[PDB]
Design a protein around this ligand. Sequence first.
Ligand SMILES: [N]C1=N([C]C(=O)[N]C2=[C][C]=C(F)[C]=[C]2)[C]=[C]S1
Length: 435
Amino acid sequence: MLKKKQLTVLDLHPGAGKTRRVLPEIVREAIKKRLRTVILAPTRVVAAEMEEALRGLPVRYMTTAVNVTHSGTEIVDLMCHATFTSRLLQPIRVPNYNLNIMDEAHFTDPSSIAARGYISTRVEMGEAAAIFMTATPPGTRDAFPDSNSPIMDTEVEVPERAWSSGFDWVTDHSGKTVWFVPSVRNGNEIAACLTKAGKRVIQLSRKTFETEFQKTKNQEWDFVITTDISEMGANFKADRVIDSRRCLKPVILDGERVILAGPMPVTHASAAQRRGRIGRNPNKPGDEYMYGGGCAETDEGHAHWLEARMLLDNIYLQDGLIASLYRPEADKVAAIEGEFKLRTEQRKTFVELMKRGDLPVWLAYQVASAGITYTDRRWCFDGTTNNTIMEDSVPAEVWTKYGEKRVLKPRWMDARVCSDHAALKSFKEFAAGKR
Ligand SMILES: [N]C1=N([C]C(=O)[N]C2=[C][C]=C(F)[C]=[C]2)[C]=[C]S1
């Protein structure tokens, strides 16, 4: 496993003990063999759970989610998938790790796909070893894998809007339910319907994840309404999962705009991870999984794989060489390796637009490749009339850094900057030059 030139996929079923049992054994062996090691966590929540499982082992936590005093003698580093990809992109020196361990290696965010591509390329070159830990590796076709205890699987119509009748089974339940919705806006509507019926609801999404997840431990709740982010190792002490089996898919149209297509079916990997939140306790057989549609390979042509190539084309590997995507997920995009490689100054703009600007990868690339500098926000206002961003069915307006009231009409339209109130508020602040 730990020998150079080897990539191992640790594919034990969900709840089999990959993080709490297998991971500390691997880390202990890596420290014994003097292997400079990196452990990659999908989120800050998982990074905190990993510290608990690794307590007593000398690990340098490169995240503010863990409060530890490092001795300076650790040869194992732990950081989030995004942090690893970010440090590779920035001028900062990243050690050439002998062993690369990725937990929740099924994560399909652009920085996670790019991290897999880089690490797998290093292993292919015979320079390093890697271990990818996931119950659902890329290409998996089984939405119903093994579990610690039997699960009641039921195909049923699941609401995606508020309802007045026809779904008594949803509210008649007396336990705790984790409900996967296709979007933040869809979750808001269902959460309001359940709150009106007397239920205590917590909502989770990528932007509110660390703060709102704490509420699942600190208070009594009846429902957790979440997007696909809870597929990445978040654990709940729940009795039931309700799964719409739907997700939004960012799609690049004619290479000039990004729309959020769907809702459409999730992959089998996503369905298995959603179901995998329950059936984890061998002492409580009969947790329920209610599912509202079929699976499909909706990752083919998904913007995230093209965005992963934009990231990889701008990471130094060796001379003019470029890291390829991890082989089982390479056909998800039709791209030319190196097509997105930027010159030094435009690359710095690209990185700053993502890191400080908080823009999606595709949108950051359009701005940087056009030769626009980070602080120049004229492009947020000079697009075509069809790129007008709407807020409450009326064009969104902002006061520019010059003091002029203008309609938000970006030269490149990426639907992710206005998919919910929180995203549109952050994009308005960016267009106004507030960051
Ligand atoms: N899962 C769930 N539930 C059911 C149960 O647990 N059951 C049992 C136990 C034990 C035994 F021995 C037998 C059975 C409820 C709620 S959640």
